[PDB]
Design a protein around this ligand. Sequence first.
Ligand SMILES: CC(C)CCC[C@@H](C)[C@H]1CC[C@H]2[C@@H]3CC=C4C[C@@H](O)CC[C@]4(C)[C@H]3CC[C@]12C
Ligand SMILES: CC(C)CCC[C@@H](C)[C@H]1CC[C@H]2[C@@H]3CC=C4C[C@@H](O)CC[C@]4(C)[C@H]3CC[C@]12C
Ligand SMILES: CC(C)CCC[C@@H](C)[C@H]1CC[C@H]2[C@@H]3CC=C4C[C@@H](O)CC[C@]4(C)[C@H]3CC[C@]12C
Ligand SMILES: CC(C)CCC[C@@H](C)[C@H]1CC[C@H]2[C@@H]3CC=C4C[C@@H](O)CC[C@]4(C)[C@H]3CC[C@]12C
Ligand SMILES: CC(C)CCC[C@@H](C)[C@H]1CC[C@H]2[C@@H]3CC=C4C[C@@H](O)CC[C@]4(C)[C@H]3CC[C@]12C
Ligand SMILES: CC(C)CCC[C@@H](C)[C@H]1CC[C@H]2[C@@H]3CC=C4C[C@@H](O)CC[C@]4(C)[C@H]3CC[C@]12C
Ligand SMILES: [Mg+2]
Ligand SMILES: [Mg+2]
Ligand SMILES: [Mg+2]
Lengths: 48, 96, 48, 96, 163, 132, 145, 145
Amino acid sequence: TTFEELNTDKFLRRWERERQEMLEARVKMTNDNVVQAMGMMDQLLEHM
Amino acid sequence: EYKDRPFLPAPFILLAHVHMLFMRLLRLCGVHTQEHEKIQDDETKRKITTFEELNTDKFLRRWERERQEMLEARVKMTNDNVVQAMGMMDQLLEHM
Amino acid sequence: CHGSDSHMASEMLHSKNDMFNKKNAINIAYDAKSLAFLSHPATQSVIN
Amino acid sequence: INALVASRILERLSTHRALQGPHLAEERAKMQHNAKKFEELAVGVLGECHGSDSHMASEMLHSKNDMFNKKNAINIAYDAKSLAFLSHPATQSVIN
Amino acid sequence: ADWYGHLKSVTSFWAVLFAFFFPFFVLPFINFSGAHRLRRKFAKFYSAPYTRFISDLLSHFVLCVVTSYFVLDKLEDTISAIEWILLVWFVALLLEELRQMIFCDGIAEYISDTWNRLDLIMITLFFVGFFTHASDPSNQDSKVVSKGIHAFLVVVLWLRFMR
Amino acid sequence: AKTNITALDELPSFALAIEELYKREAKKPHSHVQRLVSLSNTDVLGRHYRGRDLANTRAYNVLRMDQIFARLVSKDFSVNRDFTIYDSKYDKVPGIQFRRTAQASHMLFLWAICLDRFRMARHFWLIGDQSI
Amino acid sequence: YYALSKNLGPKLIMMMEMMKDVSTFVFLLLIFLIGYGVAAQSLLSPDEDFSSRTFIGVLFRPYFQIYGELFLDDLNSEANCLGDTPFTECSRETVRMVPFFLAVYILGSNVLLVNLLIAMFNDTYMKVQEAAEDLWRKQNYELCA
Amino acid sequence: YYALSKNLGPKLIMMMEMMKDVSTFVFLLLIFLIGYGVAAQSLLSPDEDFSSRTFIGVLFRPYFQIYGELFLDDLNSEANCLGDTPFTECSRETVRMVPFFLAVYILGSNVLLVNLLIAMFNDTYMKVQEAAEDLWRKQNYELCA
Ligand SMILES: CC(C)CCC[C@@H](C)[C@H]1CC[C@H]2[C@@H]3CC=C4C[C@@H](O)CC[C@]4(C)[C@H]3CC[C@]12C
Ligand SMILES: CC(C)CCC[C@@H](C)[C@H]1CC[C@H]2[C@@H]3CC=C4C[C@@H](O)CC[C@]4(C)[C@H]3CC[C@]12C
Ligand SMILES: CC(C)CCC[C@@H](C)[C@H]1CC[C@H]2[C@@H]3CC=C4C[C@@H](O)CC[C@]4(C)[C@H]3CC[C@]12C
Ligand SMILES: CC(C)CCC[C@@H](C)[C@H]1CC[C@H]2[C@@H]3CC=C4C[C@@H](O)CC[C@]4(C)[C@H]3CC[C@]12C
Ligand SMILES: CC(C)CCC[C@@H](C)[C@H]1CC[C@H]2[C@@H]3CC=C4C[C@@H](O)CC[C@]4(C)[C@H]3CC[C@]12C
Ligand SMILES: CC(C)CCC[C@@H](C)[C@H]1CC[C@H]2[C@@H]3CC=C4C[C@@H](O)CC[C@]4(C)[C@H]3CC[C@]12C
Ligand SMILES: [Mg+2]
Ligand SMILES: [Mg+2]
Ligand SMILES: [Mg+2]
C-alpha cells in the first residue's frame, strides 16, 4: 500500500515535469509570462 | 434511386407501371385527383433557423479558440507582444 | 512501480484485494478489458 | 578509442550478472543510454577528422595503439561491436 | 435514417429479409420507430427504400438463377414457358429503364451510370438471342446461335448483380 | 427522515452528503443519473429484485449506487464497506485516520466518475489508496 | 498450441484477421466464376437436358482455373474440334468462343482480383499487426489462466 | 563471393532474414497439408493396409498442389470415376468429396497463406533493409580481414 502510494506520487511528479518540458506548454508559458510582463510595465509607466 | 422506384419486383413491376400510367391518364385527361403534400409551420422553421445561427456562432467561437491555441499563432503572438514590449520600454527610457 | 522495484510490483500485482472480492489486479484488468494494461511489460513479466 | 571502449564496457555491464536485480533496472537503462551516447561521440569525432583531412584520418584509423595492445582502432570497433562506427563512410573508405 | 424509413436502426439484413418472406408472422413482433395497426405497418415497412432494395436484389438474383437455368437446359422445338416468363420479365425491365430515362436529370445523367449501360446491353442481348431463336424454333443452328448470344447475356446479368 | 432499514440507519453523515450531491444532479431535466437509477431495476438496497415512498425519497443512497456501479464493472464486483469505523469508539486505533479518509474518498470518486468530472475524480483518486 | 510462441501466435491472430479479406475476395470471385461457368458450360454442351452433372460442370473447371490448371486439352477435347490448331475445325462455331470467355475470366480473376487481394493483405497487415501483438499478450494471460 | 557486391550482398543478408518468415509459413502450412493429405489419401483408398506408400501418398500431392500442379487427371483416375464429367459415376460416393477438400485446401494454402507470406516479406523488408546494409558494411571488414 505504501509502495503503491509512493509510486503514484512519484509518477505524478514525473508526469507533471514531462508535461512542463513539452514545446506547446513552454510556448504557452512564455506567452502568459510576456503578457504578465507587460502588466508589470503598465505599473512602471504609470508610476514614472 | 430507391426512394422513387416502385416497390414491386421486376416481373411484377408491370402492374406498378400500368398503375402509374393509370394515375397519369386520370390526372391529365380525367382530372379526378391531384397531388398532396405537407408544409412545415413557421414556428419549427424559426426554431431550425435559430438553432443554425446559434451553432454557426458557436463553431466560429470554437474555431477562433482552436486557431489561437496553435503553436504558430502563439509564437507569432509572443513575437508581436515582445515588439510592443520594447516600444513600451522606449517610452520608459525616454521618460527616465 | 516496475521501475522502482520489479519484485515488489509483482507482489502488488499478485496481491488478492479484500475489497473487489479477493481478485488479483490482473483479473480486474482482464475483466475491465484494459488491453493497454495487459500488453505492458510488467504485467507480461508477472504472467510469464 | 576511449569512447568505443566506454560504449563496450557500459553495454557489457548492462547485461552483466552484477547488474541484474529488481532495484537496478533504471541504472541498467541509463548504462545502455550512456553507451549509445559515447558511440555517437566516437562517430562524431571520426566524422570531424574525415571532414578536416581524410588522409590524416586514415592514418589515425590505421595507427596501431601501444596502449590497447597494438590493435588498430577499427579492430577495437569490431571487438566493441560498434555497428554505427563500422557503417560510417570514413571507416568504409579506409576498409576499401 | 432515410434508408430504413419508419423502421428501427438496429434491424439486420436477415430480419428485414425474413419479414419480407413472412409478412404475417414477423411484422406484429417488430418495433416500428386491426385496421389502424396492420395497414399502417404494411404501408410503412414496404415503402422503405431498404425493403425496395432488398426486393430488387432478390428479384435480380432469381432472374440470374432462372436465366442461368434456361441457358444451361436445352431449348425446345417451340417457345417454352420459361422463355415466355423471361420475355415478360425483360419487357418489364425495359419499361423500368424507359421510366428511369424519363424521370432522371437528363439522358446524360442516366447514361453516365455504368449499371444503366449494363442494363441496356443486358436487354439488347436477350432480345437479339430470343428473336434469333424465335425466327426458326425447330432449327438446331438457330438454337446454337441463340445460346451463344445468351452466354454473353448471363455474364452481364451476373456482372450487373454486383450493383 | 428515520428509516426502518438497519443498513440505511447505519450510514454516516457524509454518505447522506454524497446522496444530496446525487439528488441535486438528478433533479435536472434529461439527466442520465436518474435514467441509470430507473433502468437499473433495483430496490433501496440495490439488490436486483425490482414502499413506493422509500423507493423514491431515498433512491440515490450510496449502497444502491455501489450496486449499480458493481453491475457496470463485471458479474462479480462486490465492494466491501465498513461504516462502523466512523464511530467515536475507534478513535484510539492508530492508522484509522488514513482508512476513514481513504474509503470516504473512494465513495466521492465513484460519484465523480458518475458525473464524468475528471479533475475531482483524479483528486479523490490521489487522496485515497489502491490507485491502479 | 502455436499461440505460446512469439512468432506463430500473432501470425495466427493475423490469419484470422485476413479471413475477412479472403471472404471479400470469394464474394467478388463468385460473380465472375458463375457468369463464366454457366456461359462456358452452355457453349460446350448446348443441346443437353439439365442434370446434376451440368451444375458440377459449372463449378469444377472455373474454380480450379484460378490456380493455373487451365484444362485446355480437356476443353478442346470436349468442344469436338478436330484441327491441329486448338479450337479450330469445330462442328459448331459458337464453341470457338470458349477460349475468349476464358481469356476474359482469368484476366478478371488472376490478373485483377488476386493482385487486389495482395494489396488488401498488405494494407490490412500494416494496419492491425500491433493490435494482433496486443491481443496475443491478452491471450497469453488467457492461456496461463 | 556475392557479398563483395553492393547489390547482391545486402540481398543475401535479407534472404537469410526472410528464412524465418519462410519457416513460419512452413509451420502454418504443415497443419493444412497433413490434415488434407491424411483425409484425401483415406478417401481415395479406404480399404488398404498402412504401408510406406500410404505415407508417400500423404505428402507428395498435397505439397506439390501448392505450386499449381493440381493432379486432377491423376486424382480422377485414382478415384475410379468413369463419367465424362470429372468425379462422377464413382464406385463409392465418399471419394466425390476429394475435389471439395482440395477446394478448401488450396483456398487455405495459395489464397490465404502465400499472400500472407507476401505481406510478411514486405513488412520484414521495410523493417530490416537498413540493418542489412549496416551488417553488410561490418561483413566488408570481415571479408577484408
Ligand atoms: C458483351 C456484348 C456487347 C457482346 C455482343 C457480341 C456478341 C453477342 C455477338 C457478336 C458477334 C456474334 C457472333 C457472330 C457470328 C457467329 C457465327 C455463327 O455461325 C454462330 C454465332 C456467332 C459465333 C455469333 C455469336 C454472338 C456474337 C459473338
Ligand atoms: C465487347 C468485348 C467483350 C469484345 C467482344 C469480342 C467478341 C464479340 C469476339 C472476339 C473473338 C470473336 C470470335 C473469333 C472467331 C470466331 C470464328 C468465326 O468463324 C465465327 C465467330 C467467332 C466465334 C468470333 C465471335 C465474336 C468474338 C467472340
Ligand atoms: C495483352 C492481352 C490482354 C492480349 C489479349 C489476347 C486476346 C485478344 C486473345 C488471346 C487468346 C485468343 C483466343 C485464342 C483462341 C481462339 C479460338 C479461335 O478459334 C478463335 C479466336 C480465339 C477465341 C482467340 C481470340 C483472341 C484471344 C482471346
Ligand atoms: C466440418 C463438419 C461440420 C462437416 C460435417 C459434415 C460431414 C461429416 C457429413 C455431412 C453430409 C455427409 C455425407 C452425406 C451422404 C453421403 C452419401 C453416402 O453414400 C456416403 C457418405 C456421404 C458422402 C456423407 C459423408 C459425411 C458427410 C459429408
Ligand atoms: C461446413 C463446411 C465445411 C461445408 C461442408 C459442405 C460439405 C458437407 C458438402 C459440400 C459438397 C458435398 C458433397 C457434394 C455431392 C455429393 C454426392 C452425393 O451423391 C453424396 C454426397 C456428396 C459426396 C456431398 C457430401 C457433402 C459435401 C462434401
Ligand atoms: C468463389 C469460390 C470460393 C467458389 C467456391 C466453389 C465451390 C463451392 C465448388 C468448386 C469446386 C466444386 C466441386 C467440384 C466437383 C465436385 C465433384 C462432384 O461429384 C460433387 C461436387 C464437387 C465436390 C464440387 C462441390 C462444390 C465445389 C467445391
Ligand atoms: Mg437502370
Ligand atoms: Mg493515494
Ligand atoms: Mg501452374
